Structures are given as C-alpha cells and as structure tokens.
Amino acid sequence: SWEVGCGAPVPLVKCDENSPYRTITGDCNNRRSPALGAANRALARWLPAEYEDGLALPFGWTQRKTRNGFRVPLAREVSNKIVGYLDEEGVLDQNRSLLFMQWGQIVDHDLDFAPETELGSNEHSKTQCEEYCIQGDNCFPIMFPKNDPKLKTQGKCMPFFRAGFVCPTPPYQSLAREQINAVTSFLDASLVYGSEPSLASRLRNLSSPLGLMAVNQEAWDHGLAYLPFNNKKPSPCEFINTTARVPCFLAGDFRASEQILLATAHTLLLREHNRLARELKKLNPHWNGEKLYQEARKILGAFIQIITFRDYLPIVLGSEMQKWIPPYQGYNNSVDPRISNVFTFAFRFGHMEVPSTVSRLDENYQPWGPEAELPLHTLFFNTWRIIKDGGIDPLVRGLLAKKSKLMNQDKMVTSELRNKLFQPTHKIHGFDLAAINLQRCRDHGMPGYNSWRGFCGLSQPKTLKGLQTVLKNKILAKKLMDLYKTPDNIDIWIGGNAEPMVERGRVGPLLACLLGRQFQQIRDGDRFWWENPGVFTEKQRDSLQKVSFSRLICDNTHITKVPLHAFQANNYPHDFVDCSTVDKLDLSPWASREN
Amino acid sequence: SWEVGCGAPVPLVKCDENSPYRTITGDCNNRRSPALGAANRALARWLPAEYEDGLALPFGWTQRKTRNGFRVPLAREVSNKIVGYLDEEGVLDQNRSLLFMQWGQIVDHDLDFAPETELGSNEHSKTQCEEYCIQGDNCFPIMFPKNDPKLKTQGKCMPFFRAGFVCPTPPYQSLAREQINAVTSFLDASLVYGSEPSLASRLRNLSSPLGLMAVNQEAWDHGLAYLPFNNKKPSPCEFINTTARVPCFLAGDFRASEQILLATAHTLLLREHNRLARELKKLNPHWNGEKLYQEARKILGAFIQIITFRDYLPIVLGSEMQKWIPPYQGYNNSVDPRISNVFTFAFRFGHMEVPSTVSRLDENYQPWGPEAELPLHTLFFNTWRIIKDGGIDPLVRGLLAKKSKLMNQDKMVTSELRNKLFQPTHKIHGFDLAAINLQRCRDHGMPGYNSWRGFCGLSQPKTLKGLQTVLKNKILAKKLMDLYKTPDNIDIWIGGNAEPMVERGRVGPLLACLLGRQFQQIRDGDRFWWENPGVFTEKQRDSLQKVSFSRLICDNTHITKVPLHAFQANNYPHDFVDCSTVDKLDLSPWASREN
Numbered sequence A, B: 001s002w003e004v005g006c007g008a009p010v011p012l013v014k015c016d017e018n019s020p021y022r023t024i025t026g027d028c029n030n031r032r033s034p035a036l037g038a039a040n041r042a043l044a045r046w047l048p049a050e051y052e053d054g055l056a057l058p059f060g061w062t063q064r065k066t067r068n069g070f071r072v073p074l075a076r077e078v079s080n081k082i083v084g085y086l087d088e089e090g091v092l093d094q095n096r097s098l099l100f101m102q103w104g105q106i107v108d109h110d111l112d113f114a115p116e117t118e119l120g121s122n123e124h125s126k127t128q129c130e131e132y133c134i135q136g137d138n139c140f141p142i143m144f145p146k147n148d149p150k151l152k153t154q155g156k157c158m159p160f161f162r163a164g165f166v167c168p169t170p171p172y173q174s175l176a177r178e179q180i181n182a183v184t185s186f187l188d189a190s191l192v193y194g195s196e197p198s199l200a201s202r203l204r205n206l207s208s209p210l211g212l213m214a215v216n217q218e219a220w221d222h223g224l225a226y227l228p229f230n231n232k233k234p235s236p237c238e239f240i241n242t243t244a245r246v247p248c249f250l251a252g253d254f255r256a257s258e259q260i261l262l263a264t265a266h267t268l269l270l271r272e273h274n275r276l277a278r279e280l281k282k283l284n285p286h287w288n289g290e291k292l293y294q295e296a297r298k299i300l301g302a303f304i305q306i307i308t309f310r311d312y313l314p315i316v317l318g319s320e321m322q323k324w325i326p327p328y329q330g331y332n333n334s335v336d337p338r339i340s341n342v343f344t345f346a347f348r349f350g351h352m353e354v355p356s357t358v359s360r361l362d363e364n365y366q367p368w369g370p371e372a373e374l375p376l377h378t379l380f381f382n383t384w385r386i387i388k389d390g391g392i393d394p395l396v397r398g399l400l401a402k403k404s405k406l407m408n409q410d411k412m413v414t415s416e417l418r419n420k421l422f423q424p425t426h427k428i429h430g431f432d433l434a435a436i437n438l439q440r441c442r443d444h445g446m447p448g449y450n451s452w453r454g455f456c457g458l459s460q461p462k463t464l465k466g467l468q469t470v471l472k473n474k475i476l477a478k479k480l481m482d483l484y485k486t487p488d489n490i491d492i493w494i495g496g497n498a499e500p501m502v503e504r505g506r507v508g509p510l511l512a513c514l515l516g517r518q519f520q521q522i523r524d525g526d527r528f529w530w531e532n533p534g535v536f537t538e539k540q541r542d543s544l545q546k547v548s549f550s551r552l553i554c555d556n557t558h559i560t561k562v563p564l565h566a567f568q569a570n571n572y573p574h575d576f577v578d579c580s581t582v583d584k585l586d587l588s589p590w591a592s593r594e595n
C-alpha cells in the first residue's frame, strides 16, 4: 500500500559512498534514499495535483466542465487583459541591473526543467495540431479569444504541447499525472556539465588529459573560447538568419541559446571552468584529466551557490530572507531536496523583469557601433550576433550598466515576450510567454491561488474587496474577478505575481514563502553543500568567500572596469573600478601533490 | 571525424611506463595508446554490432521486426528443443578430468566481464521485471514458450537485465551500443588481485610490511588459509543456508564464489601468492611490502600464462593450435590486446562441459563422509560446504580424479544449469544458463552464425542440406532450421557449439578460429608477456617453465598424490604419483644481492 513504488523508466546507479564528488545525474547525494534530487524523476508536490478528471486532463480541456461551477478564462485572454501594455517609458528598475534578471534565469535552469513530450514522433500531427488547432492527446493549443489581433494574422491558435510525465510515458492513468524534472535539483552547475552522462561526456575534452570542457573549433573571440556547436538539424539558430547559418550553442542545459544574454552567460561559466583546470595543472602538474575536471567542477558549483545565496536571494526575498533562509546549521538528510512542481512556476517571476531592448557597449560603456540597441525579439535563439557582431564583451557591458524591467501591476510582461516570442520548433515570432505560463500551470495541474495562500499561512480572499485589499489595487482586482469569478480559480503564475513586492524584495508575500522554502530545502538537503564541514577544507572556504560576479567578468573577458556589487544599478564610471582592485579566488589551498 | 573521444566512465591517474610491473587498471601496457586493454572499456568489435534499429535494440525485441524476413525464436524455446537432455549416464568425457572444465572458467574470468546493468537497486525495476515480466528499458525478460513446464511452477518469464555500455550508461542511441569489459584484457591474475585500485588495495595486508594478501581470520583449513569473507549485505551465500550463514568470499573478481569449485580454485591461487611472498622475504629480507606484493604478483602472473598456453590451449584447440597460435616472435605493440565482443560468447563452450554432480574425496580418493557426491545446483554460491565440510582438500581431490562432461549434439547442457541455475538477486534455483546465453548474444548485438563462418573463411549454408553436412547430423540440423528458418539467423553461441569437435580438440572449427585468434592477440599484444625479453631474465624463464598445476596443489594443500597431467583423465592410483616427483619452482634467480 506504500506509495514508493511507481517510477519505471529511469537509471538505478549504485554509489561510491565515500567518493568526494557529486554524480552527474545527482544520484547518491542522499544515502538512505539515493534517488532524491536526481534528474529525470517526478517533480515534488507540495499540494496534490488538481485535474478536470482528477487524473490528467487540464482545467479548460472540456469546454463545459467548469472549475467550482465557473468556466476558466482563456489563457491568451488573461494575457491581453491584465498582463500587457504598450509604453516602455519608466518601466526599468532603478536599483536592479540587467545582471539581476540574467542570474535568475541561469539559476532557474540549474534547478528545474519540464520539457514537452518527444511524442509527436516520425508522424503527422505535430503539424496538424499546429495547422488545425485541435486539442488532441498531448496537443493542447492556446485559442485566441474574440477580437484578438493575432486572429487577423496567425489563424486561430498558438501551438502548445503538454509536459512529459512519469512511469508509462504514453498510457492509461497513473494516479494523478506527475511531470518530470529533467535536471538535478541541487544547485550544482548541471547547466554547465549536463545532467545525463551521454551529454556530460560529449561536452568534455577527453582527447587531452587536462580536464577541460570541449570548445568550438570554428570561431574565437579575441582568443577567448565559445561554446561548441550543437550540430543537430534543423537549427532554430540557423533558421532565423539562413544567410549567416550560425548554429545554437551546445551546453549542459538544453535552453542555453534561447536568448543572447543567456547564451552570453553560459560562455562566462564555461570559460571560468577551463580557467580553473589550467590553473590547477600549474599548481599540480601530476593531476590527471579526471582529477582536474572533477575538482574544477566542484569549485564552479560552490561559486554558484555562494553568489545565489549571499548576493542574489537577499535582494529577491528582502524582509523574508532570514525568515525562510536562516543561518545554515549543517546538512540534514531528512530534508527533501527535490524541486517542487509549484516552484517551477513561482520562479517565473523574472518574466516580468525582462526589458524590451538589449544593448552592446564599447570600452567606455558608450554605444557600440551603429546598432547598439536591438529589440529583444530579434535575439531569441540568436547566436550570429555573438559570433559576427563583436563577441561577448559589448554584451557583458550591457549586463552591468543597463537595468532590469521592474514588476508593475499595470505593465506586467513586455510584448517582445507577450506577442513576439520565438519558439524553436515553429517558424514565427508570434508566441505569448504569458499565455504559455498560464497554459503550463493547468497542464501541470496547479491548485488555485487560494490553495497556495492557505499553504503559505496567508489570508485567502473570497470577495472583490478582500482581493482588492490583498493586491492593494482595486482596478486590477476588478479585472481578475471578472475573468476568474472567484479567487479560488486564479492561476498561481498570475496570482503570485499580482501581489505587490515585499520591502527590499522583488516579489510579493505568497511568492516569497514559496521560493523561500524551496531554497531552504536545497541548501539543507544537499550532502555536497559548500559550507557542509568536510566538503572543502576550512582554508578553501576562506578563499571562496572572496568570489564575485565582478571578478568572474575580469578573469574571463577583456573588460577592465566593473562594479563591486554587480547586482545593483551601476553607472559609468562613478560606480566602476579597475579589475585589479576587486579580489581574486586564491587557488593556493588546492595545491595537493602531497608527500 | 575521428571520434576517439566517446567512452565516458574513465579515470587516468597517469602511470609510470618506466615501471617494472603492471597496473591494476591495465592501462599503460601499450605505449602508443595507453588505454588498450584497460578495465572499464568498450569490448572490441571484430564485426559491427547488429541490432533491430541498428542502434541498441536487440533482435527479438519488437515482435514484428524480423531478421532477414523471419522472427527469431525465443531463447528458452531453443533451449528446450535443442539443449536439454534427461540421462546424465555416459555423458562424461573419457579423457578430460574435472579441472579442465574449471580451468576454462578461471581463464575466462580473468579476461572478460560485462556485468548486467547493476542499475537495479532498491527500486522496483528488478521486481517489475520479475513479477510482471513487462519488457522495457534494461528489463529484457525471457518469456516462456508454449507448454513450458516452468509456466506451472515459476510464472511467465525469467528476469534479465541488459549488459552495460559506454559513454551513455543508462540511456540509448550510440554509433552502436558497445558493452563494457570490466576487468583487464591481459592474462594477468586480475581475478586474484582485482582490476581497480580501491578493491585492489583492500585485498592487501598493509598492516604488516610483508606484501601479503589479506586472509580470513574466522576460519582456517587445517592451518591453510581462506579468502577473506565479504561482509556486504544481502549475502547470497548466506541466503542458501541462513542457519549456517557463511558469507561469500571477496576476491579480485566479482564472481569468485559462484560455485564451490570456482571458490576452491581461488583459494589455491591466494595461497600461492602469499607463499611466494614469504619465501621472497627470506631470500631478500631487504625488500619492502610493495616490492614483495608486486614480485609475487608477477610470478603468479607468469604461472597463469604458462598453464594456459602450454597445457590448456592445445587440448581445447587441437589440430588448430598451430594455425592460430604459432610460437612466440615477441611483443607486437600494434596488435590489439582487447577482448572482442564475440569472444565472450565463444568461450562459453565451457558450459557444455559442466557435469551434474560434485564429489569430495579423502586421502585414498574414496567418498568422503556421510555426504560425498552432491548435485551441482546445491552448490551455487555455496561456501559453508567449503568451510564447514572438510575444507578444499576433498574438493581438490575430486577435480583431479573426476571427469568433465563431454559436449554432445544430443546432450548439450545439464539441467543443473539449464533449469536450476541460481541467480544472486533472486530467491529460486530455477533459471536457465542456456537461455541467458542466447538472450545475451542479442543484447550484445551479436551477428549471426553465417556472418561468423564467413569471417573465419568457412562455408555459409543456406539449406537444410548444407547445414546438415556442416553439422554432420540429420536430426539436429532440422531442429535448428524449423526454429530459425535460415542458418543466417542462428545465434553464434548455439551455432558454434553445435559443430563437431575438431580432431584432438574440444571445440568445432568456427570456435577454434575465434578462440585461436583472440589468444594469439592476447599473447602478441601484451607488453608484459612472460616470454618477452627484459620482462624476466633468461634464467628466471628456465625456472618458470617447470611450474605445474600438479606442483601448485602440493605446495598449497595437504595432498600427497597427484598425476603428472592434472588436465587429462586419471584414475587413482594407476596414474597418480607421489609429490616427490613433479619438479618445483626454484626461486633462486629472484635473489637480489646488494653488490
């Protein structure tokens, strides 16, 4: 009767109990229960799934079954009516740089990924779905409402395919449907080294015995490396400028080339790794290839954990930081380290921090060349603007000296994402990130807004004026009640995101609780956390406290002037300093060709 | 391009190829390319892998994809109709003692291992495969055919898990699924010393500096030693008699105590190393433990190469010993030392040589005790009968004086193995080594029987009449044809073993060809061959050419009567002599004077 049985298609590897390095897939982190946290298992559930048929079909599937007696509004309709806006004057964040958002997306892609389903195989309805807008098995199209502009221009729907789910992957019931997390739940740089060993091998240079990651052999960036090319065909990156025909970048994470600043950051992280490998061959000429790669991999992971928890989270969570992430007390093999399903929608608050333009800047942080400012929608899956427009220096400069978009109850998500998103399988710049996220909620069986308030110890509004008081916004609350009829039906994504931000934070109270818990459970339940005594010698810890994003940029670009607190809003040159001023990671405590 | 980069599960540790000994891992034997021969590597392909989808899926996987236009028969069905027999009377080989059988297993176990995907640990893949028999991923269950008695007593299937494979390790498509050889390819005593360092270091006595192998403290064979126990749980050797609960032994090879006479041989080998170790300290009290360990290791290394090539191979290969293994013309460092994939199935000819019983014999070679002859299947993973019942001396005595089973086209595999094999994981003596072999050729993507005849320059029959003449057998040929429809589809393991033995040998021409080739590469491609110049002095070579299996028993048991050829049939006492006869291993040239 115990529900610890299901889970057929997945590896089952046995563990090295006293190995000092993480696995690639994440097995063997926990000893009593070793699959906890590993790639390619079911996402954790903090509250049971909720489906139209209690089983797998999403709310809004059958054009009749209500939800608690009310119909659910169209997802694109919720986008048009609440999420969009036209004017981009005055939307930026006066205290968060563009780096603030980009680190959010990079940490997201370390923690979770729920990919659409391989099925749609060598067949003929991955297109008829796209071509006739007919819901079918795993094709769940997003229908345009009346008067929606896209009707005059994109037919009747946007494509949408549901996310993959455990045990038999195309079957007959399976308790409630549960979606797969295809990466590791530990904050462990899976996005650099991969979460599957076929991929992790292919991403390394194993021809030499130096512990490096493979690098491209077609282009260079003033002698600094680029990611290798993912040569599989067809390429969404080649598709958007078939003249240039530059492929997408191959990295530890499937999403690396989705937008050019994300691809920019994947480069920094990979350059850093190789930088450690040849420094450690210097200090330790006797170390082999395996030793070098494993030991560099462990430093970049701590590097990522420290920046996340000391520089990023405090300015996300604000007044809720120490109430969810109190001081580390040591590893606790009872804590669940799995990412929750609901976490993979709470973290999509960043979609409202994405601004509508992206800049390249020159040595003095002035516009670089004639077209320094490009619209974001022309940079989805755009690699040729890296290779054939100056490499990554002008973009990293934009990350430091420009700004994130600010959350705003009357200007939620930029149209560059709300109408002009590009999706790699399809061909047009016509999609709606906002509608996707709302359709993904229901697909994942998310419980309503008020189930998660209750879950977070929060007041559960029932009326207009209750909602008006929670949202501190009477107009907005009126629109949502028109659309959903009861706060019990508000999809968690727009729900969590509609709440004003806590003090010195960048989310509201509901979302602060959700993310706060999850980051709690992923520090405390990881056997390889960096503070965990025994992972790193106490001398190594005191070197890793000096890490900075600023120093990361120094060591792996040709940028000589950077700020000291890269996450805040910094202007040139007042808040900029020289790159020998900043502090280095001192490798000497890693010298171990011991007697 | 030249993807010499795939092959993920690897370290490196570099080496010291100015070192006078072997490595445990087997790397650094070939200088141009150090990994040729190393543990944890892809098996070599003498012919390309052949699969349903040309990638990873075995023939027989999809009940709808023929091979050459016909469905492949079920493995258990072929085993029922071809390989079984009822009367063990008259089956014994009139001129091969039991040690001939045993010595084949010990050579095999040194050279190749391809463990089933050990990805099956506290997890319901094992039991989903066992109790529900549902194909999927690495579960490749052996379905029972129509009328199979085991239907009534064991269920629908026998469980089976596909062998491991390189770069990816759980997932799928490769240039071809290439399975792993988990031990060193060299005739090198890796079954005694182990093939990875972790295990290799644990088997050693590093509490004193005498260079000995850890020995068992709990029990002793009249003052002689036993292998140390294995305290990991659950213990299959405890399973088969919890009240006795004597655990399996822990040797340099996973499967050391799979049957009581295999464990026996292992105990002889340990006793020899430590013997050399303590007789080496005497000549050279100025030698450390590590020097004693290696030097003993090396001699034992030589002895295993001597017995195999001087005494075993001529009687297996017969009239084809010369054509495939001509006398030694020195190390050739462009010969591939690897074990091919097909060889691991070719060497399973020894399966048809395992008789139905095992004896114990007292000092006069008469039945020993109130239970002297025991059925084979009561002795899978049986160690209490070693340590609780007389020790090994009675068991050794049977090996000398009892006969091997002769191969036989109407009496191929005894039911002890064909119907009552014990598998470590499961609870029942009820598996089928025959069906596992045929199932395993398909896992390993083996080509058919006529692909392998051609490769050996043999005739490729297409007819009942051509297969009749090849097999010199009317009845057997038709039973193959009706099951396989075309000789091209006959799994190599049964086609090769179906052929009449060559004159003076114990395998047919196809096997003699695949066996002969490999052993030739095993000799010519090993930089550390006992007859390569510089390896051993010319003087030490004079010594080693007089070691004997008849000597090795005298030096490590309390047996005083051995025949001069322990490999042929010998009845007590007409063919037995007293140990004062059979020449020793004079260790004088191992005396290193200080001058």
Ligand code: HEM
Residues within 6 Å of the ligand: A101, A102, A103, A104, A105, A108, A112, A113, A114, A115, A258, A259, A344, A345, A347, A348, A349, A350, A351, A354, A380, A433, A436, A437, A440
């Ligand atoms: C294009 C996209 C972005 C930038 C140009 C972008 C940005 C972010 C940030 C900054 C995030 C967090 C701090 C973040 C979170 C998550 N996203 Fe998003 N995002 C872009 C585009 C997408 C697309 C397309 C998806 C797929 C949605 C679907 O269901 O098909 C997407 C998802 C996510 C996500 C969930 C990951 C998962 O487990 O599946 C986030 C946590 N983003 N994005």
Ligand code: HEM
Residues within 6 Å of the ligand: B101, B102, B103, B104, B105, B108, B109, B112, B113, B114, B115, B258, B259, B343, B344, B345, B347, B348, B349, B350, B351, B353, B354, B417, B433, B436, B437, B440
């Ligand atoms: C060679 C050889 C192999 C394959 C080694 C490899 O994996 O590369 C082999 C295998 C086995 C197995 C596992 C088979 C599978 O699951 O695929 C079992 C359970 C088993 C049992 C016994 N064997 Fe064997 N065997 C090989 C060779 C030989 C030889 C060679 C001369 C003899 C003799 C022998 C004997 C026995 C045996 C005796 C009682 C048992 C039990 N094996 N083998």
Ligand SMILES: *[C@@H]1O[C@H](CO)[C@@H](O)[C@H](O)[C@H]1NC(C)=O
Residues within 6 Å of the ligand: A205, A207, A208, A210, A213, A214, A215, A216, A217
């Ligand atoms: C592997 O390493 C060598 C340097 O040791 C380098 O020249 C080569 O280009 C690397 N290969 C790749 C694919 O990065």
Ligand SMILES: *[C@@H]1O[C@H](CO)[C@@H](O)[C@H](O)[C@H]1NC(C)=O
Residues within 6 Å of the ligand: A240, A241, A243, A244, A384, A388
């Ligand atoms: C395509 O790429 C080339 C660079 O090779 C660039 O010069 C050109 O302007 C690009 N065109 C478009 C439409 O993006």
Ligand SMILES: *[C@@H]1O[C@H](CO)[C@@H](O)[C@H](O)[C@H]1NC(C)=O
Residues within 6 Å of the ligand: A329, A332, A334, A335
């Ligand atoms: C470990 O986690 C559990 C579950 O949340 C908690 O009850 C317990 O207090 C924790 N233990 C320690 C020592 O912090």
Ligand SMILES: *[C@@H]1O[C@H](CO)[C@@H](O)[C@H](O)[C@H]1NC(C)=O
Residues within 6 Å of the ligand: A095, A314, A315, A504, A505, A568
């Ligand atoms: C920007 O944010 C940080 C942390 O929230 C804070 O220390 C700093 O004072 C803020 N700046 C302004 C102008 O509020």
Ligand SMILES: *[C@@H]1O[C@H](CO)[C@@H](O)[C@H](O)[C@H]1NC(C)=O
Residues within 6 Å of the ligand: B095, B315, B568, B569
């Ligand atoms: C047994 O066979 C071997 C095979 O080489 C042969 O040499 C021997 O003569 C045979 N037995 C006897 C007793 O001759």
Ligand SMILES: *[C@@H]1O[C@H](CO)[C@@H](O)[C@H](O)[C@H]1NC(C)=O
Residues within 6 Å of the ligand: B205, B207, B208, B210, B212, B213, B214, B215, B216
């Ligand atoms: C190691 O060698 C010493 C020397 O006799 C012995 O006392 C000790 O028991 C040995 N240990 C093992 C495990 O063999």
Ligand SMILES: *[C@@H]1O[C@H](CO)[C@@H](O)[C@H](O)[C@H]1NC(C)=O
Residues within 6 Å of the ligand: B240, B241, B243, B244, B384, B388
């Ligand atoms: C268990 O072992 C004891 C001897 O140690 C023996 O008497 C008994 O028969 C064995 N039981 C079984 C079931 O083999």
Ligand SMILES: *[C@@H]1O[C@H](CO)[C@@H](O)[C@H](O)[C@H]1NC(C)=O
Residues within 6 Å of the ligand: B331, B332, B334, B335
């Ligand atoms: C050495 O082996 C190579 C392997 O290709 C083979 O060509 C040749 O016959 C052998 N020659 C010598 C001199 O060993």
Ligand SMILES: [Ca+2]
Residues within 6 Å of the ligand: A110, A111, A183, A184, A185, A186, A187, A188, A189, A190, A191
């Ligand atoms: Ca991860």
Ligand SMILES: [Ca+2]
Residues within 6 Å of the ligand: B110, B111, B183, B184, B185, B186, B187, B188, B189, B190, B191
């Ligand atoms: Ca070996």
Ligand SMILES: [Cl-]
Residues within 6 Å of the ligand: A095, A504, A505
């Ligand atoms: Cl602030």
Ligand SMILES: [Cl-]
Residues within 6 Å of the ligand: B095, B504, B505
């Ligand atoms: Cl003979």
